[PDB]
Point group: C2
Chain length 280, copies 2
């Protein structure tokens, strides 16, 4: 026993390495530290070759691994499973057999936001999806497409919009949505940064709140938004909450229990806001 | 020899734990990893008691320490020096004897921005300082006050403005500056987040660029600003640049050389922008 845990995250795409991410790391460390375990941090070189991970796995400098930014086909989880090294995956990849994972129901989150706008009378619901190959994105995407599919709605051209997950990302997304022959009457963004962007553009044009275009944003507006509007959110869960949930599973894993049973899936909820309204 | 390095950073104030910070960590890790050394990460519990640091120092799980977010009187550097443990300080605290530190010249950065605005004909230069007890802040503050002192200018009431280092921080700072009986003709912010705030408020009122109020921001605008204006910056240096500079010093320190000589101070420069103009 070494009593060290490694957390592996890729340096690229930089944008996804944000303050909320650093916060989760922060609490991974504290909570493992509460339970007497050290946190080895391994950022992956721009390249995604994961040499230091392998080094760690071969050299056994570490008891188990925490894997951030899961992809649907993720080569480093594949490597781990293959090598029968203990790991907890923060996300869900496709793998030939069971594995230890922790994730939120993204599919359900996006669905919730569709179900809500439908119930309010909207049919032209657009969706702004982050342009990254991380599992959570496909899943939020899948939510929106499938839910729209059910209740028989062919989503119109340009309504599914891919954006670099940034305020400028959302702003331009919004600009494109507003420019279509028949613009959407409500928008969903799949992150808070896109949310603030979409929100700012709609604000500039006077189309936010009121009889204007409705908006649902995953995680609401950023803590540092310049808008004084309550944007209806898809609420996940605090970072302190998840950091502790992770340390709890790592200890259980080291206790040597079947991955089959370390599959925790938390459910997002739909919050309150001034921004989801009846279709006019 | 353990071959592990610890990096200690406090969880609070959360705001200072931003994406640029995570980026620096990212490259600390990679660059030490290039040189065969592991990165133990120790976030400090909200509390700033640094128990896990002490634990690490007592238990010797680690060869040396990297200390982030220096304060002018910082108890954990004091602890280290006292215990004759090797450490590199990312910042400059007051200490009874020499120590290994790496810092930028903040005093010089703020001075540069004052010197520049003075040379452009400004006398009513305001300053927006982050409300945190980190050494870099006092130093940027000291820059502005001293430079104004020289060239005989009593800075007017309300011109030195303290703000939570956020876009809403800068926006409100700007609102207060604009509300004074005799508002400033140029503003300096001590971080890019304040910069975007100050910049957005001035934009909303039509006072950005042109014959309007001049602006200099430390580190320019954030990568994700919604403004299409070049704000004159005080340029520091890339994160990849500093991450490598750190690993280089840690190896030198472990090579067992006098801290007296591991005192690297890089100089900020003044960049280009559309935003620093002659006083009209």
């Amino acid at each position: 026993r070494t009593d060290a845990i490694a957390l592996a995250y890729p340096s690229r795409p930089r944008v996804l390495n944000n303050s909320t991410f650093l916060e989760m790391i922060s609490w991974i460390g504290i909570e493992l530290g509460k339970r007497g375990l050290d946190l080895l941090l391994i950022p992956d070189e721009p390249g995604e070759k994961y040499q230091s991970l392998i080094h760690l796995v071969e050299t056994r400098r570490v008891d188990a691994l925490i894997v951030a930014h899961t992809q649907p086909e993720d080569f480093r989880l594949q490597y781990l499973q293959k090598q029968n090294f203990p790991f907890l995956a923060l996300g869900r990849s496709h793998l030939p057999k069971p594995y230890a994972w922790f994730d939120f129901d993204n599919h359900a989150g996006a669905s919730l936001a569709v179900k809500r706008l439908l119930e309010l009378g909207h049919q032209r619901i657009a969706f702004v999806s982050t342009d990254a190959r991380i599992s959570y994105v496909d899943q939020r995407l899948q939510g929106y497409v499938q839910t729209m599919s059910e209740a028989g709605l062919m989503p119109l051209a340009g309504y599914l919009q891919k954006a670099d997950p940034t305020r400028p990302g959302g702003y331009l997304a919004a600009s494109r949505l507003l420019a279509l022959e028949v613009p959407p009457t409500a928008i969903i963004t799949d992150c808070n940064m896109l949310g603030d962007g979409v929100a700012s553009a709609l604000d500039k044009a006077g189309l936010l709140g009121g009889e204007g275009i409705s908006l649902i944003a995953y995680d609401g507006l950023p803590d540092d938004s310049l808008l004084d509007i309550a944007v209806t959110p898809i609420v996940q869960n605090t970072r302190t909450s998840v950091g502790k949930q992770i340390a709890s599973m790592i200890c259980d894993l080291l206790g040597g229990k079947d991955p089959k049973e370390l599959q925790v899936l938390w459910q997002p909820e739909i919050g309150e806001g001034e921004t989801d309204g009846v279709n006019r």
